[PDB]
Ligand binder design. Structure first.
Ligand SMILES: Cc1ncsc1-c1ccc(CNC(=O)[C@@H]2C[C@@H](O)CN2C(=O)[C@@H](NC(=O)CCCCCCCCCCNC(=O)c2cc3c(cc2CS(C)(=O)=O)-c2cn(C)c(=O)c4[nH]cc(c24)CN3c2ncc(F)cc2F)C(C)(C)C)cc1
Lengths: 90, 105, 148, 128
């Protein structure tokens, strides 16, 4: 049911595997003939917690007939978040 | 009505959703499934307030408008440490760098 | 052009409803496929409009040209009003990818001349400079229509 | 009386031609900004009252004006000074407010162009 995503600084993030599959990179890493844990040496916890929030948002609001709220991003995390989204392919 | 949560203890963060009508005990059962510690060995918190097992999340102040997928509410977790519960301690995440000058209003 | 309004002259009442946190630019595609923007709608507001059968519309963020959805899709074409009932055009935010949402936020904080002063990888400069726009999107929607 | 009349003149040998730094600003800065505006499209050419089925348009609107005429005039050095050009933009807007009902979508587009026009015109250089 769940996967553990560990940030570069050692924080553990336990999310539903289905939610973490929102990332094309994580989906490929977990693919193939299981692995329940993924480390990210280059993504810090302030960024990885935000990526996990986006996974929840994507799964909740994709295909929903209820109006979608804005996914918020503070200016302080924007560049690092952009770099993580680009690597994770989500 | 779904409430989106971050159950945090030390450097562990569980992302999970639950109903407003669901109980604090039902949340402890989620934690036991992941972190392998029984409900009686857990203490759940909203800020510094210890939550009662039989209370529904809604009765604890966790609402849908304040526990969103994109901005989840935090539930503190404290595990049993021998004959006493450990002090509630949530390690904060890393800090972003100083905001670049080309991003300042 | 494949993406254009049909000159029907058959009136059709439409309700443009902005259910997004953005200011909406309703864009009417004329009889030659050209985008012809109409007055904006502030977030949470709506307005009746005298439109016509076969007229083709798309909805954009008025300040950045980010693509919006209408009735959970990209384009809107109203049918003839059955018994005077208006046709509803519900405009909402799409679930943008995290990378497109991050590009939107950086673009809103950084002037285009300062993109190359950001401590990000080279390929992220080209992505920031590739601003969303109606013409870019019309070619893609046309190439999807050819396939489907 | 449907047929559209001949458009406004944009060149006259008997009317004095003239170039100033204000008339260059009105073309390169004001007209250029308004021409590229998202709401410029109903104002870039004379109102085709026939094709658009606009009753009494040229009966009610005695001094028709559009941005194409102003642009061609600016380009031909038709105006004597900036005020002569500014009067033409005002007439284009006023024509819209007169003919169309207050609150129409065309009137909102004219109001956005006019608001922008006044801002640009507020920074008209002193004639030098
Ligand atoms: C008549 C009425 N009865 C009772 S309620 C009512 C009514 C009608 C419309 C509306 C607002 N609903 C719309 O707009 C809708 C939305 C969308 O479906 C388009 N659509 C239309 O209605 C269109 N019709 C039709 O398809 C049916 C008739 C087909 C005519 C075929 C020939 C058209 C040539 C197309 C190219 N030419 C333009 O596109 C254009 C439109 C326009 C003005 C100037 C031009 C350029 S040009 C040929 O003159 O060089 C214009 C300018 N100026 C300075 C005025 O002062 C005006 N006063 C009225 C108009 C103007 C008409 N107009 C226009 N109007 C409203 C706008 F918001 C934007 C506009 F551009 C247009 C845009 C063409 C009017 C509200 C109430």
């Amino acid at each position: 049911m769940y996967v553990k995503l560990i940030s570069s600084d050692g924080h553990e993030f336990i999310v539903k595997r289905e939610h973490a599959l929102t990332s094309g990179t994580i989906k490929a890493m977990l693919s193939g003939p299981e692995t329940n844990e993924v480390n990210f040496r280059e993504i810090p916890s302030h960024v990885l917690s935000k990526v996990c929030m986006y996974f929840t948002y994507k799964v909740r609001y994709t295909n929903s007939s209820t109006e979608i709220p804005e996914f918020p991003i503070a200016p302080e995390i924007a560049l690092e978040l952009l770099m993580a989204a680009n690597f994770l392919d989500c | 009505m779904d409430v989106f949560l971050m159950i945090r203890r030390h450097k562990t963060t569980i992302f999970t959703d639950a109903k407003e009508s669901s109980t604090v005990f039902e949340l402890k059962r989620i934690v036991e499934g992941i972190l392998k510690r029984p409900p009686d060995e857990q203490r759940l918190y909203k800020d510094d307030q210890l939550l009662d097992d039989g209370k529904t999340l809604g009765e604890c102040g966790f609402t849908s408008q304040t526990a969103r997928p994109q901005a989840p509410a935090t539930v503190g977790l404290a595990f049993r440490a021998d004959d006493t519960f450990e002090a509630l301690c949530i390690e904060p995440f890393s800090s972003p760098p100083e905001l670049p000058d080309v991003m300042k209003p | 052009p494949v993406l254009r309004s049909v000159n029907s002259r058959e009136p059709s009442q439409v309700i443009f409803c902005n259910r997004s946190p953005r200011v909406v630019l309703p864009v009417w595609l004329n009889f030659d496929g050209e985008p012809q923007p109409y007055p904006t709608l502030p977030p949470g507001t709506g307005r009746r409009i005298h439109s016509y059968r076969g007229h083709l519309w798309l909805f954009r963020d008025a300040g950045t040209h980010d693509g919006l959805l209408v009735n959970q899709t990209e384009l809107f074409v109203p049918s003839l009003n059955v018994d005077g009932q208006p046709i509803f055009a519900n405009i909402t935010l799409p679930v943008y990818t995290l990378k497109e949402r991050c590009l939107q936020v950086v673009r809103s904080l950084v002037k285009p001349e300062n993109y190359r002063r950001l401590d990000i990888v080279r390929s992220l400069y080209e992505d920031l400079e590739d601003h969303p726009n109606v013409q870019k999107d019309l070619e893609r929607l046309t190439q999807e229509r050819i396939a489907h | 009386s449907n047929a559209n009349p001949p458009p406004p003149e944009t060149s006259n040998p008997n009317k004095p031609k003239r170039q100033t730094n204000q008339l260059q600003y009105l073309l390169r800065v004001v007209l250029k900004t308004l021409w590229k505006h998202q709401f410029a499209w109903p104002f870039q050419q004379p109102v085709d009252a026939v094709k658009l089925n606009l009753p009494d348009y040229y009966k009610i609107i005695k001094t028709p004006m559009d941005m194409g005429t102003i642009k061609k005039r600016l380009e031909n050095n038709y105006y004597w000074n900036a005020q002569e050009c500014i009067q033409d933009f005002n007439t284009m807007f006023t024509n819209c407010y007169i003919y169309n009902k207050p609150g129409d979508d065309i009137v909102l587009m004219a109001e956005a162009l006019e608001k922008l026009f006044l801002q640009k015109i507020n920074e008209l250089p002193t004639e030098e």
